[PDB]
Amino acid sequence: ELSSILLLLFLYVLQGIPLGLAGSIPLILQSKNVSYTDQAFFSFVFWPFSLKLLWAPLVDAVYVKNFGRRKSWLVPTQYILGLFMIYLSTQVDRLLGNTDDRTPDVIALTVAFFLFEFLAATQDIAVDGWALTMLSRENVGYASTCNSVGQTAGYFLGNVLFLALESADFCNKYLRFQPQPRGIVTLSDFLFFWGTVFLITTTLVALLITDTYKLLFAIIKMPAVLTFCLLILTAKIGFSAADAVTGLKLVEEGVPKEHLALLAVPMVPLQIILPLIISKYTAGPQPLNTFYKAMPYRLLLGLEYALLVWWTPKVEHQGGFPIYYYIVVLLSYALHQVTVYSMYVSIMAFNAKVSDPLIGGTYMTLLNTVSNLGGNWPSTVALWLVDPLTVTALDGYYVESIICVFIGFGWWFFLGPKFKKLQD
Ligand SMILES: CC(=O)SCCNC(=O)CCNC(=O)[C@H](O)C(C)(C)COP(=O)(O)OP(=O)(O)OC[C@H]1O[C@@H](n2cnc3c(N)ncnc32)[C@H](O)[C@@H]1OP(=O)(O)O
């Protein structure tokens, strides 16, 4: 069934294109020198892909007659998302402010990328339901690893490829003979091209209830998973400050967003390799053991991010930017994403350990939803608390990183044994 799994791979690359763009916009807005209250108001865009389960039964409960049950919300979501990308490519010339140095109207850009993300998340639900019925039962795990590789490849084409092809600096150092300004593609041309790709793949793929919410209310009423809910909400505060603010403080204190995006291309082979290493801790009877043993390493790499942002102004920016800075920040991001990926596969292994086969297909993604909510809300609280902590004499990111590391080690030393006993 190669004729369908390549189409499903292409639909997950088109899933990853809005996520890649939504991850690229904070780097662009920080390159335009916007304040962090505006950045935290933008950071609501990362929440619908986390909280897609809150409308997943609403989009899996209804469909149209004499048509596919999940194709009924695949192709209208794809058409609305593509037409919205055409309109956003028209209006993004004035939303970012590339005309006469105007300020980025971030609120309209927030609601644009928020509804855009929302459409991306419900299209992910439509494909994740569509994967169970289009291909055979024998290839059901191939759909899951195809979701993984397609999401990562489409996020690569929107976060890394777009920023690598967005500026004049990288596109006149590399990828071009006879250098010329304004880069390969702007955001208007990139959005217009992927909107055209959305419309054509949508036309080709088209021509060729409250009981679930009552169940979710009963689950979140159940005590042990409610304890896991509160724990995974208050868990990721300790490193969400580093993981949310460091990528923008590096853009302010000097390293370009294009190099910070291209810094992720050595990580996708390691993103392949690392679950094949931590598969033993996944299959083990205590799946939160590598969570609890990767928590302090992730907080110490949060301090190492704070030290790296402190070290960024003390290295020379003029002329050829040095490669030892890039090998330091690449080993830093490499070890930090090692502990990110070990923590994430520990959460996935805990959900596979706990989720019963009765309502497992809902309870699995419920715990995934609540872990991603607990990952994405202290991002917004961190970016909102950047600006009141700037005493720039004393910067706010360093005192925020110290306070959030104290919150994370407080979480660790106070709620370690409880979170370790929740798996029994
Ligand atoms: C929305 C989604 O895609 S799924 C979210 C739920 N899953 C999770 O694991 C929780 C993580 N929650 C987050 O918010 C994560 O930081 C992300 C990955 C979703 C990114 O959201 P943000 O808070 O806006 O972080 P941001 O995109 O600004 O990071 C700056 C970029 O520069 C890079 N970067 C970050 N830190 C550094 C650093 N110290 N040095 C060099 N580069 C860095 C990263 O490649 C990052 O891009 P990414 O999205 O691939 O991680």
Numbering used by the authors: 71 to 278, 294 to 476, 505 to 537
Provide excerpts from the study.
To date, SLC33A1, also known as AT-1, is the only identified acetyl-CoA transporter within the cell. This protein is localized to the ER membrane and is responsible for transporting acetyl-CoA from the cytosol to the ER lumen. Acetyl-CoA in the ER primarily serves to acetylate the lysine residues of secreted and membrane proteins, as well as the terminal sialic acid residues of gangliosides. Notably, disruptions to SLC33A1, whether due to insufficient or excessive activity, can lead to various diseases, especially those affecting the nervous system.
Subsequently, we resolved the cryo-EM structure of the SLC33A1/acetyl-CoA complex to a resolution of 3.5 Å. In this structure, SLC33A1 exhibits a typical fold characteristic of the major facilitator superfamily (MFS), adopting a cytoplasm-facing conformation. Of note, the two halves of SLC33A1 open to the membrane’s edge between TM5 and TM8 near the cytosol but are securely closed on the opposite side, between TM2 and TM11. Additionally, the linker region connecting TM6 and TM7 is positioned externally to TM2 and TM11. This configuration strongly suggests that the substrates would likely access the central cavity through an intracellular portal framed by TM4, TM5, TM8, TM10, and TM11. On the ER side, the luminal gate is predominantly sealed by the interaction of TM1–2 and TM7–8. In particular, the adenine group is nestled within a hydrophobic pocket formed by residues Thr331, Leu335, Leu345, Leu348, Tyr390, Val414, and Tyr418. Among them, the two tyrosine residues, Tyr390 and Tyr418, encase the adenine ring through π–π interactions. Our results revealed that mutations Y225A, N229A, Y390A, and Y418A significantly impaired the transport activity of SLC33A1, highlighting the importance of the polar and π–π stacking interactions with the 3′-phosphorylated ADP moiety for the recognition of acetyl-CoA by SLC33A1. Importantly, our molecular dynamics (MD) simulations further revealed that the binding of the 3′-phosphorylated adenosine moiety of acetyl-CoA to SLC33A1 is stable, whereas the binding of the tail part, including pyrophosphate, pantothenic acid, β-mercaptoethylamine, and acetyl moieties, is relatively unstable.
